Amino acid sequence: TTIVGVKFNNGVVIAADTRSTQGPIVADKNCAKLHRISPKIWCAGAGTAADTEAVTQLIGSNIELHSLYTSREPRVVSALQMLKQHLFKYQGHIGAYLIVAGVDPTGSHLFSIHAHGSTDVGYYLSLGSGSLAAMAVLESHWKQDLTKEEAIKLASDAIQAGIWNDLGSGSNVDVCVMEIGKDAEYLRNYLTPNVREEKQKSYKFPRGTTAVLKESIVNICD
Amino acid sequence: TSIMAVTFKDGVILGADSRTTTGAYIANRVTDKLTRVHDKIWCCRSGSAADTQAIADIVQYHLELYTSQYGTPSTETAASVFKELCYENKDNLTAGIIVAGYDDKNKGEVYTIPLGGSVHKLPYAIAGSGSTFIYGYCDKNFRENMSKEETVDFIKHSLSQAIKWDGSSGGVIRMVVLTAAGVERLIFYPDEYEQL
Amino acid sequence: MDIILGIRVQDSVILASSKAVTRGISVLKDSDDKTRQLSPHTLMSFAGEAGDTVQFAEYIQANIQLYSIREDYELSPQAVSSFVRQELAKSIRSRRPYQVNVLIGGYDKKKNKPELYQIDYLGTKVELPYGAHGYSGFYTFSLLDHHYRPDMTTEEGLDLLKLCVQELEKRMPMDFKGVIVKIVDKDGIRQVDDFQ
Amino acid sequence: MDIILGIRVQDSVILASSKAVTRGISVLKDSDDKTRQLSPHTLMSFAGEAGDTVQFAEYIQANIQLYSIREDYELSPQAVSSFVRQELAKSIRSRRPYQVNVLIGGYDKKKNKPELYQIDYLGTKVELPYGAHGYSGFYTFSLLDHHYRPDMTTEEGLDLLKLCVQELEKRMPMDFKGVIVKIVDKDGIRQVDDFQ
Amino acid sequence: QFNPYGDNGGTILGIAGEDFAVLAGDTRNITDYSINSRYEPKVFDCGDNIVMSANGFAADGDALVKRFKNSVKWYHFDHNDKKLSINSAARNIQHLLYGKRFFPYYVHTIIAGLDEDGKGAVYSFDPVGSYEREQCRAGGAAASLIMPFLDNQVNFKNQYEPGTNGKVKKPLKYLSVEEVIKLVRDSFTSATERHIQVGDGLEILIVTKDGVRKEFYELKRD
Amino acid sequence: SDPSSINGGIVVAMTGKDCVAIACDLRLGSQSLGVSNKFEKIFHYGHVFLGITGLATDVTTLNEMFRYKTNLYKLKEERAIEPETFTQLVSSSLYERRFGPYFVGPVVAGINSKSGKPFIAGFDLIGCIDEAKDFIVSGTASDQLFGMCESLYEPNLEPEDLFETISQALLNAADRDALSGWGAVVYIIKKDEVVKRYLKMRQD
Amino acid sequence: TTTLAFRFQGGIIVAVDSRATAGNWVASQTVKRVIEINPFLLGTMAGGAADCQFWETWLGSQCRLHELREKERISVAAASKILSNLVYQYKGAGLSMGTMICGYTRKEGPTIYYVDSDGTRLKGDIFCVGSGQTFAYGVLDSNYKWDLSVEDALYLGKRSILAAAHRDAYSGGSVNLYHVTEDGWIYHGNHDVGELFWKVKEEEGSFNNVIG
Amino acid sequence: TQQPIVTGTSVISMKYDNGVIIAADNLGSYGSLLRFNGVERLIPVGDNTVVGISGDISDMQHIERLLKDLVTENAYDNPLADAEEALEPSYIFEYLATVMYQRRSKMNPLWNAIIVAGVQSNGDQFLRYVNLLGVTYSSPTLATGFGAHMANPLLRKVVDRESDIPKTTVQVAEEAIVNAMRVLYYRDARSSRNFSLAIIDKNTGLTFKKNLQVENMKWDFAKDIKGYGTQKI
Amino acid sequence: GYDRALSIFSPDGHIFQVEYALEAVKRGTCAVGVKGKNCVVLGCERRSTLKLQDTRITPSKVSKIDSHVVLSFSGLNADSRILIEKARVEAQSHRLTLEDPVTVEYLTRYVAGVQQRYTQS
Numbered sequence A: 001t002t003i004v005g006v007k008f009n010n011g012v013v014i015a016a017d018t019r020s021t022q023g024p025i026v027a028d029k030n031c032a033k034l035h036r037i038s039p040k041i042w043c044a045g046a047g048t049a050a051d052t053e054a055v056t057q058l059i060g061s062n063i064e065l066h067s068l069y070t071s072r073e074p075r076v077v078s079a080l081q082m083l084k085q086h087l088f089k090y091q092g093h094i095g096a097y098l099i100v101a102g103v104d105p106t107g108s109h110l111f112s113i114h115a116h117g118s119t120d121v122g123y124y125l126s127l128g129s130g131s132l133a134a135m136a137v138l139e140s141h142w143k144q145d146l147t148k149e150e151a152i153k154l155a156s157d158a159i160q161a162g163i164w165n166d167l168g169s170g171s172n173v174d175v176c177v178m179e180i181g182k183d184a185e186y187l188r189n190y191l192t193p194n195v196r197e198e199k200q201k202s203y204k205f206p207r208g209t210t211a212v213l214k215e216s217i218v219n220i221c222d
Numbered sequence B: 001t002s003i004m005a006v007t008f009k010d011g012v013i014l015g016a017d018s019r020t021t022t023g024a025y026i027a028n029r030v031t032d033k034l035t036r037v038h039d040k041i042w043c044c045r046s047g048s049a050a051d052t053q054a055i056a057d058i059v060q061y062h063l064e065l066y067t068s069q070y071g072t073p074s075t076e077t078a079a080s081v082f083k084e085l086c087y088e089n090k091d092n093l094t095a096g097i098i099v100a101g102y103d104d105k106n107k108g109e110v111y112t113i114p115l116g117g118s119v120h121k122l123p124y125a126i127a128g129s130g131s132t133f134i135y136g137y138c139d140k141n142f143r144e145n146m147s148k149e150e151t152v153d154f155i156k157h158s159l160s161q162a163i164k165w166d167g168s169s170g171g172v173i174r175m176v177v178l179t180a181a182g183v184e185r186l187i188f189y190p191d192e193y194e195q196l
Numbered sequence C, D: 001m002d003i004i005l006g007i008r009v010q011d012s013v014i015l016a017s018s019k020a021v022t023r024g025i026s027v028l029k030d031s032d033d034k035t036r037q038l039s040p041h042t043l044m045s046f047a048g049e050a051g052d053t054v055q056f057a058e059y060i061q062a063n064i065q066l067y068s069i070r071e072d073y074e075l076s077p078q079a080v081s082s083f084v085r086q087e088l089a090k091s092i093r094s095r096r097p098y099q100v101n102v103l104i105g106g107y108d109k110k111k112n113k114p115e116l117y118q119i120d121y122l123g124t125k126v127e128l129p130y131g132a133h134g135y136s137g138f139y140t141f142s143l144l145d146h147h148y149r150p151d152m153t154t155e156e157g158l159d160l161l162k163l164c165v166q167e168l169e170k171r172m173p174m175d176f177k178g179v180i181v182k183i184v185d186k187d188g189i190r191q192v193d194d195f196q
Numbered sequence E: 001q002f003n004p005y006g007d008n009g010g011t012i013l014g015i016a017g018e019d020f021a022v023l024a025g026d027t028r029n030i031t032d033y034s035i036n037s038r039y040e041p042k043v044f045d046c047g048d049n050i051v052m053s054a055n056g057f058a059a060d061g062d063a064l065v066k067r068f069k070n071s072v073k074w075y076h077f078d079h080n081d082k083k084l085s086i087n088s089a090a091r092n093i094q095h096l097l098y099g100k101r102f103f104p105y106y107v108h109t110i111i112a113g114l115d116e117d118g119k120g121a122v123y124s125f126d127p128v129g130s131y132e133r134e135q136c137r138a139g140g141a142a143a144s145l146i147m148p149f150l151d152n153q154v155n156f157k158n159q160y161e162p163g164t165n166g167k168v169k170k171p172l173k174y175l176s177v178e179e180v181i182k183l184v185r186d187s188f189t190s191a192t193e194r195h196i197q198v199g200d201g202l203e204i205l206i207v208t209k210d211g212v213r214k215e216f217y218e219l220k221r222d
Numbered sequence F: 001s002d003p004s005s006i007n008g009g010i011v012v013a014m015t016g017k018d019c020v021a022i023a024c025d026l027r028l029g030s031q032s033l034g035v036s037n038k039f040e041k042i043f044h045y046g047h048v049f050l051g052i053t054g055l056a057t058d059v060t061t062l063n064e065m066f067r068y069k070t071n072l073y074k075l076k077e078e079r080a081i082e083p084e085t086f087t088q089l090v091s092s093s094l095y096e097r098r099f100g101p102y103f104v105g106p107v108v109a110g111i112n113s114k115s116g117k118p119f120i121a122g123f124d125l126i127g128c129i130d131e132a133k134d135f136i137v138s139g140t141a142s143d144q145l146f147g148m149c150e151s152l153y154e155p156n157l158e159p160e161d162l163f164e165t166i167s168q169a170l171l172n173a174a175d176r177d178a179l180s181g182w183g184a185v186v187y188i189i190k191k192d193e194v195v196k197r198y199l200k201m202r203q204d
Numbered sequence G: 001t002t003t004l005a006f007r008f009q010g011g012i013i014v015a016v017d018s019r020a021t022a023g024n025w026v027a028s029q030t031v032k033r034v035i036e037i038n039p040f041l042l043g044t045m046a047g048g049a050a051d052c053q054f055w056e057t058w059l060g061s062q063c064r065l066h067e068l069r070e071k072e073r074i075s076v077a078a079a080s081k082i083l084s085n086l087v088y089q090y091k092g093a094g095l096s097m098g099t100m101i102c103g104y105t106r107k108e109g110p111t112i113y114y115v116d117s118d119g120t121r122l123k124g125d126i127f128c129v130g131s132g133q134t135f136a137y138g139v140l141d142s143n144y145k146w147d148l149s150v151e152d153a154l155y156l157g158k159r160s161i162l163a164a165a166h167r168d169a170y171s172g173g174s175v176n177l178y179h180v181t182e183d184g185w186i187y188h189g190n191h192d193v194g195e196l197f198w199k200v201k202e203e204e205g206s207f208n209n210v211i212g
Numbered sequence H: 001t002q003q004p005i006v007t008g009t010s011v012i013s014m015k016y017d018n019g020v021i022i023a024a025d026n027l028g029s030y031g032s033l034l035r036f037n038g039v040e041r042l043i044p045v046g047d048n049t050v051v052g053i054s055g056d057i058s059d060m061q062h063i064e065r066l067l068k069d070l071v072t073e074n075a076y077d078n079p080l081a082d083a084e085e086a087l088e089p090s091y092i093f094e095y096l097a098t099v100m101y102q103r104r105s106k107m108n109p110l111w112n113a114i115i116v117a118g119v120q121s122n123g124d125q126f127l128r129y130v131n132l133l134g135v136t137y138s139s140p141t142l143a144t145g146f147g148a149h150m151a152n153p154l155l156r157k158v159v160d161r162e163s164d165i166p167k168t169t170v171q172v173a174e175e176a177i178v179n180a181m182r183v184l185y186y187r188d189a190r191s192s193r194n195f196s197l198a199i200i201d202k203n204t205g206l207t208f209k210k211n212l213q214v215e216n217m218k219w220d221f222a223k224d225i226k227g228y229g230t231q232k233i
Numbered sequence I: 001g002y003d004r005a006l007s008i009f010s011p012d013g014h015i016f017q018v019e020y021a022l023e024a025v026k027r028g029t030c031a032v033g034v035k036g037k038n039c040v041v042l043g044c045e046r047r048s049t050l051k052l053q054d055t056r057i058t059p060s061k062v063s064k065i066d067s068h069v070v071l072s073f074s075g076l077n078a079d080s081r082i083l084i085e086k087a088r089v090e091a092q093s094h095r096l097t098l099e100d101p102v103t104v105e106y107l108t109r110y111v112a113g114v115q116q117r118y119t120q121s
């Protein structure tokens, strides 16, 4: 897994690859690793995937209720404080490693949070088994005052660093852009550089080829 | 990491490298380890980042509640909330904290809280992994009641040595100055402190 | 491990259970009954950890008796075993699991069929023409796979079972002091007094 | 555990050895003879670790048979047993000790006396009226301590043995598949054609 | 403590046609989650019409390939340049392997070529010298994803004649080389998708009475 | 020692044109010992089919639990639960036991009665959702299953075809796993009807 | 795996399965678990595949050198004691072997020695070895007659392996059958457990709790 | 069987159109104490080969001696010691890969990762890796330690495959290496600013650059970074 | 480590140390054996150099090797003892490893081999 977040002049973009692994096996060649906390606060997750989903949906739900109660738009600094205090409680047993990005009425934000409950702030970040490939690219091509289109390119490339160079990362690139005065823009499969080639054969069986002992139609409706 | 706080004539200055590391991999090279728990009460954090951010967050909450009830807390009181959290939870924390702040009654003050939950009031305090290498240097170079410029240099030099030798330290030298004038943030980049 | 055997024939369920109880290097008893009658048409045999084995069986017994009194009715074999499986499935995640494996043999009076259920201490249940717990099945399953017919009389079942016990007495390192054999049919539950 | 028993009566020595051979979960053989003839008037029974027992036994047999031809003399039982005792005491401190226990039963044709020797895998040798290796003593020694007489006939000694095997057959968890009985007297070595 | 062993990924595959034999392997060499090389071949021509792959721990696999090539040369020296028969090669490899029975080559070995009747042939080995002649055998990381496919597609397992209802097993026809090459390529593109240690390139060595030729196909690079 | 490997067994699910298929082996064993040849791992609640592999006592418990839950659902909601909703219920249920989980690998298959679209999903033992549109695999031969599926599967198969495909995937993969087999059942599922066939396979 | 040998009036029947597993993974359904030491001696493979296949081949070399020096067939006793003695030199080093050395000489008649990596060597009439052994014993024990026909003996050995292939997860694939006579051994084919199960079920009426 | 004490970190390398570049920093660490700074971990062998070394430094020093001795002895009774019979890069590597493997196989390894860089006498570029396990492989890019995680992904963008090598000039390839060296100094905690670099070009020969520093560093943005999520001052 | 070649060829192709060993044999007390239809007898000759010889404790000329095979010699006495020990041990070892006593030919071939080795070492 490789996830990154890059700040640009008017917002923030996060990106992730689409590969879920069980050991050395690829279970999903298109997993969505970009999660929604609120409409303009999004999350990339790495670690135990049940945990990254569990924790973003929980804090997601509490964030919604806080929002309805205070009649205010959700703040990133809140999803941060809530994530980190939940994680810290569980001493890292909740294996969620997270980059949280968003725009709110105070500006644009980018943080990373660790399973144990530590948080970091920066203009560019990465996590995952592709963390290193991605951060090499970011250390090479980042500058302040990125345009939107520049920050997409950058974040997009960094994921490609992990797709190619990291065994744990692969397949497609997912991006979400959240810009200060606009709707969060979510690009599922922004990049698909990994299409499987056409097989050398079709493996359709001639019907009747399987040996059957019993048939019986099944009762759906009571 | 390498952290220190030094008292001088006009107040007190905290310093730190900006490197946090996970093994040999530098997870963050622009870390801010200087942490505000009150207007003129700051801390230097070292140890588990999670343990140490969480402790600071609770102390910030406590002194804020203190403030709304009994006005401004003493540096000594900030140190006490820290000690209390660190001592009573000693089995489940890896935190080494230098607390530093300013009063008009008291001027600059420095408390170090090491792994014990013990608490120690010192004229200056070093801590973090890089600290071992500058024990000798600082003992030969600390003078009481230095000027602000003297003190900023004493920290610059010490921390550049700690960063030089300890690979757990590095990046930028950050400082925070606490005087009656108020609160001043300083930064010093590699190219500057390396060639000293 | 001691012998727990069951075969369901045409119109009854046979349960053969080993007679030995061994603690240490001494065989403490050669006449132990590893069954409880749960209702007059439902028999339960059991093997496992010392203590747990009887405490559990009698627990279940009391429970099925209570129900019988409360409803003036006799739970079907399928209902008793589901009850039992669930108790086992609860205890597996408890602080101290019962380490008990059971066969439940009953004659369903409504359905007019004998039924044999095998349930291990995890709560793994299955309905079976023949079953066993422990190593008992490793020796005997081959004989049963060969000779079993669902139309077998009770005397034919007993022949097949006798054969099974002979193979255990031959190839198994332990002396289990023989088996007690019980039959559950439409008339209820009886002990075959002669199985030498 | 394997059964290794011996008793010397008036003018003869009786050795009883369990017939079972178990590899893990199966009893591979029920007709095993756990003795080697060393001299025409000396028998050795053995029990212990799987490969070691026969390798040792046959090694000792070869050496006694070689001595016999070299001298045209049959070494005395006491001498044969001192040789064996030294061979085990060498091995106990070697790189892989033979884990074998033995009884030696022989008629000293020179002294007209039956003699019985007990030696364990570590070289501990002792001369006895009756002896047993492993757990075998625990069941039978109360019987022998009671009934044993130095002046017993071979018939009486065979009866005493019959009692011992019965006690073993009822209190021991393991089925040792019975025993082979052998007598060493002045006429040499014979096996009881039917016992139990 | 020092660990004398490692794992370099890779999967290999050997199939025996009735007058030919192929032996194929991917070309990616890995360590943990890192890719060491996208092209480092591990199927070799050892002369006398014998191709050989030793997949597993690469140091051991290299060492073993060296020793065998060298035993072919010494066989020639010692027996007036007699051709090393595939069965003799196999028996000799047993001895090579079993020499380290208590410090094994951590590899799975396959060799391919023609027997002394012109018929195609595959031998596969334990790490410690167990060996059998076989029709087809994949080995290494993705062996378990490839073997069932082969059982179904080469030996027509579980297939019967339509309308026979499992009363007539679908008849074994035997496959041309190009046909067998298709199965190898599909096998590998498949394992590439679902196994993270498989990709980059696929090199197939083909052995006929006319010698040893070598086809190469690209694989997905994530 | 590995709870997901004591009993054995596998489940594979697949989507074709206006249909979905879900198959399982029939084996239940204790390590090397084959106990039952009739232990099915595919259950349904209305028109939602759930296949469970893993520890047998949990497979059972989970089925009883999802019956219970989908019963109270129908009662309160007055409609049968849909696949996507169910899949969410499975996930939240497994996560309830995050630090003491059920040792299973569940697989959901069905057709949305309103939207008509075919649906399959899979989970690990603590509820993370595999949201794939092609096939989902689970159990002790999950590796073999992956290899076979990636090759054999092509999208939009008619029911009669998809049956051939999913059966062949199940069969050969189970024959390369010591802990799976002893018979098999395949469910072909459409909006109108659901057909259930028992395959013939080697009994070793 | 499951391997069996037993002697009867007509010599020795040897029967084995052919499955190899590493973990849960079935690595092969086609392994030869019978080692043809020489035309008069069979060995069976259990425990370590390599250890049996290797040393029993080596056994074949030692058996030939004996025949050249002594100008006579080696006794099954001597052949087995060579294997046994060798193995015993390695005790503790981690060899894994369980095996029947089987042969028919004039001096001895049909003879079976069980030999294992512990240094055990046993003469006997019926042996089974491997994870499936306990199943095969049951069938063998209740049908073994000394005066079994040859046709029937071949069946019993085949049926005993089928028994264990069905119940044991680690045995299966196919049955390999041998008859050992004094003139040497005769291979009696490879029968897939797949097909054999159904035929046996149908024709014999057994395996009743299986749907077919 | 041992454990490393004084250690050197990443060695990075790639090949361009007419040769190879290899680089390595000048640091000998002692656990987390950055002890020795004048440590040369690139070792040129004659004039067509550089061997770069990471791992245990005492073991490096040993291999260093083995290489001078390899050169001394190649000269013995060889009037072509600097012509048709000079040490070739493939010779040195096969030698090295042989010793590593034997050392691992005696369960007493040299605790090192080695890259051997050079040009063969027919002009061919040589780039191959070997480590304490005796494992060997080649690629247009090669790196050890953190370099395989951070340096390779960058270097691979210049040279993805074989056909990219002819298209890659020495200016481009050297710039890529110096960049990677800076990235490594940003992110690897056992790295040093001072490093050495060597080009082995098939026309210009061995060029050996020393006392280089990582330059053009971006640290300024750090002033705008305060607290760890919630702080404002 | 004395390894001087004592048994070598001379130009006529004779090995003189082996031949001088034969001379030692001619000197020794005569020995004979003859094969019955169902027995073998060994006859030897008693030395008549001196008497006052204790007859019950002087080494006899015939030695049992196993219980079914005897060896008699002629020549150096001290030499014959060594040969006898070696064969008695091989008789046992042969039984230990093959579970048969030695055939007479096997044991002959064994002893023969030992002597041969001493002509070439």
Ligand SMILES: COc1cc(/C=C/CCCN2CCCN(CCC/C=C/c3cc(OC)c(OC)c(OC)c3)CC2)cc(OC)c1OC
Pocket (backbone or CB within 6 Å): A001, A020, A021, A022, A045, A046, A047, A048, A049, A097, A127, A128, A129, A130, A168, B022, B023, B024
């Ligand atoms: C005992 O004290 C010490 C501890 C340490 C620190 C040791 C290890 C560091 C901590 N971690 C180890 C590495 C693992 N980790 C995980 C980070 C992200 C995981 C990426 C990822 C990978 C995957 O595939 C494997 C995923 O798929 C399942 C995935 O999910 C989307 C995410 C973070 C934490 C270092 C020390 O100095 C040298 C030390 O002093 C002696």
Ligand SMILES: COc1cc(/C=C/CCCN2CCCN(CCC/C=C/c3cc(OC)c(OC)c(OC)c3)CC2)cc(OC)c1OC
Pocket (backbone or CB within 6 Å): B001, B002, B020, B021, B046, B047, B048, B094, B096, B115, B127, B128, B129, B130, B168, H032
């Ligand atoms: C700057 O941030 C960091 C903090 C830390 C964590 C610092 C904490 C150090 C932990 N300890 C070191 C300090 C000392 N210590 C115990 C002292 C050992 C002596 C044994 C002892 C035991 C006794 O018990 C009976 C004694 O009483 C008699 C006694 O007498 C003094 C001595 C244990 C614990 C580690 C870092 O990486 C390297 C790091 O860099 C990013």
Ligand SMILES: COc1cc(/C=C/CCCN2CCCN(CCC/C=C/c3cc(OC)c(OC)c(OC)c3)CC2)cc(OC)c1OC
Pocket (backbone or CB within 6 Å): C001, C002, C022, C023, C024, C048, C049, C050
């Ligand atoms: C401390 O020293 C003393 C010892 C003794 C005499 C010792 C006897 C103790 C009593 N117990 C020991 C023996 C009996 N026992 C139960 C243990 C049974 C073990 C058999 C067993 C077999 C199995 O195989 C079938 C098992 O597997 C299912 C199994 O369960 C794990 C257990 C519990 C209690 C008496 C004393 O008098 C004051 C005394 O103090 C001076």
Ligand SMILES: COc1cc(/C=C/CCCN2CCCN(CCC/C=C/c3cc(OC)c(OC)c(OC)c3)CC2)cc(OC)c1OC
Pocket (backbone or CB within 6 Å): D023, D049, D052, D099, G001, G002, G019, G020, G021, G046, G047, G048, G092, G096, G097, G098, G116, G117, G118, G129, G130, G131, G132, G170
């Ligand atoms: C049929 O094929 C299979 C066989 C087996 C099991 C193989 C059984 C072979 C038979 N034996 C070989 C295996 C080992 N064995 C005895 C164990 C040896 C104990 C070693 C030892 C250690 C010591 O410790 C130092 C000792 O000294 C105290 C000592 O005594 C001298 C001995 C018993 C006999 C398991 C399988 O499942 C995966 C399988 O199917 C693929």
